[PDB]
């Protein structure tokens, strides 16, 4: 069926909004898919028109071949514009538009159009009537029935066609004879119609009006009844709705559910969409389940929830209400599905899998709010426990699958991310993803090994770096300094606190109307990038700060304070114990906040595609010189540095030009200052521990001013830089904290310590014991400098340890942490069940324990390799990918070449309704579909087969020339190895990513993915046939999305309130979790084949079950637009994975504390620690820090809105659930 022009038709339909099927079938009839068609009349083209249409309205502004030749993209786009104009001009009647297009208009057209208008199909010409008839299916018209009155239909009963046509007078014959299959369902035309207030991106004046006059901007998103005519009415309606809902909450659903969600048997499925409800007046005190009830808390700890961010107990309440609604509804869903299945097989008990956790969650929350007697706690008598994952004992319950019970009787269900049994088993059976990590050694073990004895030097370095917890030496005056370990722990703690501060500030910033209310301007990660970039630019140029909204102002203040503190610690690393510690900071006397200079790999790649190497270097140098000549402060500091460097009283401009060129060479001809996470991933040799990249990227110029390149287009060094403080601030912190620790503990730099340790190794090369000690010391240096790599799994194990500690001491925080973790587990397990039911490939092959086919294994190898290659070659900056996707549209190109007014990309961008409406699900599906396309293209190229995307039209959809595609083929052949089995490997990894053709490969895959897989509004089985394992998975996910949008609840909800934002949130959460689970399943099947034959069945059964797939989903969900990473908010210290005299010593020591943190009450919303606060901070993380980190980290997994929980629940209900089996 496809004929190489499908992407062109799809884009020409999204732009100039018109039916894709209409344009495609017009191509069918007119030309039967040939670009130049020989016609006796004379018209020659894809759409077969010379006539006057051609010049017409289309050109005469550009050099046009026209009547002779037409560019196929231009021809299709112009014809699509004409058809859209006709369709609109004829109201929505596509058949009259098709008649006008085929028969023309005026000379013979208008009489036939009028004849159409009065019924009168007899007056319409025979050819036009046949043309309309062959367009009947794809075209929608009020006149379709009248034309029908003026066959490959699936048989209702009996034999096909004749049996039901010539006969079957009985009803079924009538139903068949009146059928008329449509084949014309458009999800955004029929199901989700873009309203006026969706898709409408605010102007600055509208944005300011909304910011000033709208109390809660989320009420802008709902459009109940008729659409308000003007923004003032929308604002009025939003405010009235907000006041009404705030008033209603006092007796609303929160208050009604505050007593007995599941003790009362509340069924959330029979519920109105509960839009206004934000969990608020929701304190679940179930009367009964409150046996004992002290009004006074036992300690000053406990009392309330110990979170330290403002708005706590309220976002927690929203998460709790959403989780209770979801869990009760999922229990109801499971019971109903069990009843439906018992109809078929009465002798099958099935398992609820939700009502146990939900009952215990109600009991815990009830006791938490009532302060006493958790009734969910089990009777621990006759329990031997035994079995410790991280020193936490547990008993497996035979009654509940997985679901261990803790020391106090607290029972953690399976799929609870923190329970020790699931964590342990996930560690034992984890698909390829298990790595070296930090399992080598920890600070406590290295202290015992190296502070132990045998050398004066080894012990000297150990005393400087590592601290002994308990030692036989017990040095009375071992060191009056911090030591590198303590500095590292202190810096980790302060960084974590400021990360939670930044997370809260960024959430508030990116909830503002610019990104949340109107039509979706940008993806979530792109809003995050824009806000971080605004903060960074305002930091560098303070005049931009008046342009920040108060929330972005808070964000910028947090980031500025963090970077100022880091600079202060590098400049004065003697602020710790060591007095001979001096200024690890690269270039002092440059007095200003240093936001790290890190340059995008792909920005440099683009600036090398033109102006290859010397061009980009000259551009960087010349922009720096623009800064130098423009601003006298830059000139002053650069002149001072050059005078000091060359020892000359005067500086000639040749000197500063040479300096700028030498510094720009480091960016242009080296990848040291780029993202380059992969080279840091390598650990051997201690080569990269020297030469911190963040500090060497420092220069005295300003990257702000732009220089025009030889083609006249403007480039500034800021265009290269990577903002977003999501990969940038954490990595900068890792490196600089390592450097600060090394200098504050040892007077020496990282380089000097590296050389001295290598000298010790070379000296004691003979002794095995000494060699092991030196290797432990090297491991300490790797941990300090951040080489390490803790992995994702430290999050849940750290949470388990901290929650155990809370259970010992802070009861209310303990129970709240259990509640939030249980809610996360139920969310993810419900997702696993529903999507295992719904998506076909998942249940049929990947969620099943049975091993897959050999061809299926090859497809899985291709898919996982495609994901890996995407990770290597994907542009990290969200701006780069958004502009790359938008710019390739015809509108931007035509405006850039012909237009006299500048316009802007993202203003002329066509944009799929999938992006405008339902943006988050769209981004997840683009990412996964592009990875699938990469895998398919690579596998086909290495195999030698020709992809469907090698064809000219889909290449024209991207900017892929004939030549570029051949270059892509050569690149894949050059850097990729075809394994003996389906296994795929890369050669040199780094060199492959450095190839310029890698960007062409990525662009090809991404644009093909968009055009073919995600852009169309229709999903079909034939569509799923073409793609590979990942492609089929994500097409079935897109089909699942469309099914959900057509579900009764979701359809009714959109009719009542519109509010595509809520549906987008729900479907994006579902898609994230499901793709995580699917990737886990594919990697598990691959690892199973990695095992020998007898072990494959046991391993697949053990590693492919709802608990482990659910734990993978929580661990590896993407969370694309998340401010900071979930590891950063809660992450253990790298080195720190794990009688009364020392007690009394610690007591008498802390008896004296008089730092301002102890004296003063903590700030509400922003610590804003300076160097004094960092130095005076404890190394151990306080329970407030852990608890706020847990709440922030689960804010991504566990949504705060009860409405999105209800929407996810109803999507699952319409989908169905597996229900386990037997026990």
């Amino acid at each position: 069926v496809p004929s190489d022009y499908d992407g062109l038709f799809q884009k020409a339909a999204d732009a100039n909004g018109v039916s894709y099927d209409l344009l495609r079938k017009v191509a069918w009839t007119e030309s039967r898919f040939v670009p130049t068609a020989k016609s006796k009349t004379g018209p020659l083209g894809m759409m077969q028109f010379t006539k006057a249409t051609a010049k017409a309205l289309g050109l005469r502004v550009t050099d046009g071949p026209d009547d002779d030749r037409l560019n196929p993209e231009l021809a299709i786009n112009a014809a699509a514009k004409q058809l859209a104009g006709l369709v609109g001009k004829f109201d929505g009647d596509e058949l009259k538009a098709a008649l006008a297009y085929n028969q023309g208009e005026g000379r013979l057209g208008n009489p036939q159009l009028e004849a159409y208008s009065k019924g009168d199909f007899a007056s319409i010409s025979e050819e036009g009537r046949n043309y309309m008839r062959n367009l009947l299916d794809v075209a929608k018209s009020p006149m379709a029935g009248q034309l029908e009155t003026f066959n490959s239909r699936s048989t209702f009963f009996g034999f096909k066609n004749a049996a039901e046509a010539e006969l079957s007078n009985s009803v079924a014959g009538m139903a068949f004879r009146a059928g008329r299959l449509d084949n014309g369902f458009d999800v955004f035309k029929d199901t989700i119609t873009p309203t006026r207030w969706n898709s409408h991106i605010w102007t600055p004046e509208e944005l300011e009006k909304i910011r000033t006059e709208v109390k809660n901007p989320a009420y802008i998103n709902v459009v109940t009844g008729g659409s308000p005519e003007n923004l003032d009415d929308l604002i009025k309606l939003a405010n009235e709705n907000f006041e009404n809902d705030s008033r209603a909450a006092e007796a609303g659903l929160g208050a009604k559910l505050s007593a007995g969600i599941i003790g009362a048997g509340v069924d959330p499925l029979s519920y109105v969409p509960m839009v206004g409800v934000t969990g608020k007046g929701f304190k679940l005190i179930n009367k009964a389940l409150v046996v004992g009830a002290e009004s006074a808390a036992l300690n000053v700890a406990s009392e309330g929830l110990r979170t330290s961010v403002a708005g706590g107990d309220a976002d927690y309440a929203g998460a709790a209400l959403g989780g209770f609604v979801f869990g009760a509804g999922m229990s109801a869903i499971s019971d109903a599905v069990a009843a439906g299945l018992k109809r078929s097989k009465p002798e099958a008990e099935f398992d609820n899998e939700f009502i146990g956790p939900m009952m215990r969650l109600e009991a815990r929350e009830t006791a938490r709010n009532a302060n006493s007697a958790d009734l969910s706690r089990m009777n621990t008598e006759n329990m031997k426990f035994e079995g410790e994952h991280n020193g936490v004992p547990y008993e497996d319950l035979p009654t509940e699958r997985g679901a261990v019970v803790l020391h106090d009787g607290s029972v953690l269900s399976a799929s609870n991310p923190i329970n020790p049994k699931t964590l342990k088993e996930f560690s034992e059976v984890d698909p390829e993803k298990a790595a070296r990590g930090i399992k080598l050694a920890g600070f406590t073990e290295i202290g015992l090994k190296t502070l132990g004895s045998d050398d004066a030097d080894i012990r000297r370095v150990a005393i400087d770096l590592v601290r002994s917890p308990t030692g036989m030496q017990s040095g009375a005056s071992g060191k009056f300094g911090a030591t590198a370990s303590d500095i590292h722990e202190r810096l980790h703690g302060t960084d974590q606190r400021t990360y939670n501060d930044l997370y809260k500030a960024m959430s508030d910033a990116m909830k503002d109307p610019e990104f949340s209310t109107g039509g979706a301007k940008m993806s979530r990660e792109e809003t995050r990038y824009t806000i971080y970039r605004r903060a960074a630019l305002a930091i560098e140029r303070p005049e931009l700060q008046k342009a920040l909204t108060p929330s972005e102002r808070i964000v910028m203040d947090i980031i500025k304070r963090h970077f100022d503190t880091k600079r202060e610690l590098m400049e004065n690393p003697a602020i710790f114990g060591n007095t001979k510690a001096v200024s690890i900071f690269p270039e002092s006397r440059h007095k200003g906040t240093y936001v790290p200079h890190v340059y995008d790999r792909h920005a440099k790649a683009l600036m090398i595609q033109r102006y290859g190497a010397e061009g980009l270097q000259e551009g960087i140098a010349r922009s720096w010189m623009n800064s130098y000549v423009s601003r006298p402060e830059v000139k002053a500091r650069v002149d001072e540095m050059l005078k000091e460097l060359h020892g000359v009283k005067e500086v000639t401009p040749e000197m500063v030009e040479k300096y700028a060129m030498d510094k720009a060479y480091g960016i242009s001809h080296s990848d040291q200052f780029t993202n380059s996470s992969i080279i840091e991933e390598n650990i051997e040799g201690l080569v990269g521990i020297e030469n911190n990249s963040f500090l060497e990227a420092r220069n005295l110029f300003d990257s702000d001013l732009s220089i025009t390149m030889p083609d006249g287009q403007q480039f500034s060094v800021n265009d290269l830089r990577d903002f977003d403080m999501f990969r940038i601030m954490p990595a900068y912190d890792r490196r600089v904290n390592g450097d600060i620790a090394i200098m504050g503990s040892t007077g020496k730099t990282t380089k000097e310590l590296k050389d001295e340790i290598l000298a010790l190794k070379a000296k004691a090369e003979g002794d095995g014991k000494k060699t092991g000690e030196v290797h432990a010391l090297m491991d300490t240096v790797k941990i300090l400098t951040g080489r390490a790599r803790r992995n994702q799994d430290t999050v849940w194990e750290t949470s388990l340890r901290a929650i155990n500690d809370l259970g010992f001491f802070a009861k209310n925080a303990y129970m709240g942490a259990q509640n939030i973790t249980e809610i996360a587990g139920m969310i993810v397990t419900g997702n696993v069940r529903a999507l295992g039911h719904g998506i076909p490939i998942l249940r049929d092959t990947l969620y099943k324990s049975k091993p897959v086919s050999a061809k299926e294994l090859k497809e899985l190898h291709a898919s996982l390799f495609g994901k890996e290659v995407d990770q290597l070659i994907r542009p990290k900056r969200a701006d780069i990918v958004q502009r790359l996707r938008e710019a390739t549209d015809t509108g931007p190109a035509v405006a850039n070449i012909v237009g006299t007014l500048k316009y802007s990309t993202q203003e002329l961008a066509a944009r799929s309704p999938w992006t405008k409406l339902l943006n988050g699900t769209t981004n997840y599906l683009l990412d996964a579909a592009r990875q699938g396309m990469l895998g398919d293209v690579i596998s086909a190229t290495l195999t030698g087969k020709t992809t469907r995307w090698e064809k000219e039209g889909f290449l024209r959809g991207a900017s892929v020339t004939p030549e570029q595609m051949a270059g892509i083929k050569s690149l894949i052949k050059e850097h990729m190895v075809r394994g003996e089995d389906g296994k795929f490997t890369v050669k040199d990894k780094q060199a492959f990513s450095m190839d310029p053709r890698a960007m062409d490969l990525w662009r090809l895959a991404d644009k093909v993915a968009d055009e073919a897989m995600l852009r169309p509004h229709k999903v079909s089985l034939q569509d799923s046939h073409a793609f590979g394992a990942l492609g089929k998975m994500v097409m079935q996910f897109k089909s699942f999305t469309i099914k959900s949008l057509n579900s009764k609840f979701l359809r009714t909800f959109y009719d009542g309130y519109k509010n595509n934002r809520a549906i987008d949130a729900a479907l994006s959460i579902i898609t994230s979790m499901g793709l995580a689970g699917g990737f886990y399943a594919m990697a598990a099947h691959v690892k199973a084949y990695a095992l020998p034959k007898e072990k494959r069945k046991e391993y697949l059964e053990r590693a492919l079950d709802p608990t482990m797939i659910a734990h993978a989903a929580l661990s590896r969900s993407s969370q694309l637009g998340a401010p900071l990473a979930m590891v950063d908010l809660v992450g253990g210290v790298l080195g720190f994975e794990s009688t009364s005299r020392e007690v009394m010593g610690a007591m008498g020591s802390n008896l004296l504390e008089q730092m301002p943190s102890a004296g003063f009450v903590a700030n509400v919303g922003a610590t804003l620690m300076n160097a004094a606060g960092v130095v005076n901070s404890p190394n151990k993380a306080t329970e407030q820090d852990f608890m706020t980190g847990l709440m922030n980290s689960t804010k991504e997994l566990v949504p705060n809105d009860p409405l999105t929980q209800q929407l996810v629940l109803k999507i699952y209900e319409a989908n169905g659930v597996n229900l386990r089996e037997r026990r």
Binding site: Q146, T149, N169, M174
Partner: peptide, 26 residues
């Protein structure tokens, strides 16, 4: 329109057949 025409034609055929049956029984 299509439903009306289909049901009308079907009803004509059914009434024809029923009339034949009734006249046969008489």
């Amino acid at each position: 329109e299509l439903l009306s025409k289909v049901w009308s034609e079907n009803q004509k055929k059914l009434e024809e057949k029923a009339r034949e049956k009734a006249l046969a029984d008489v």
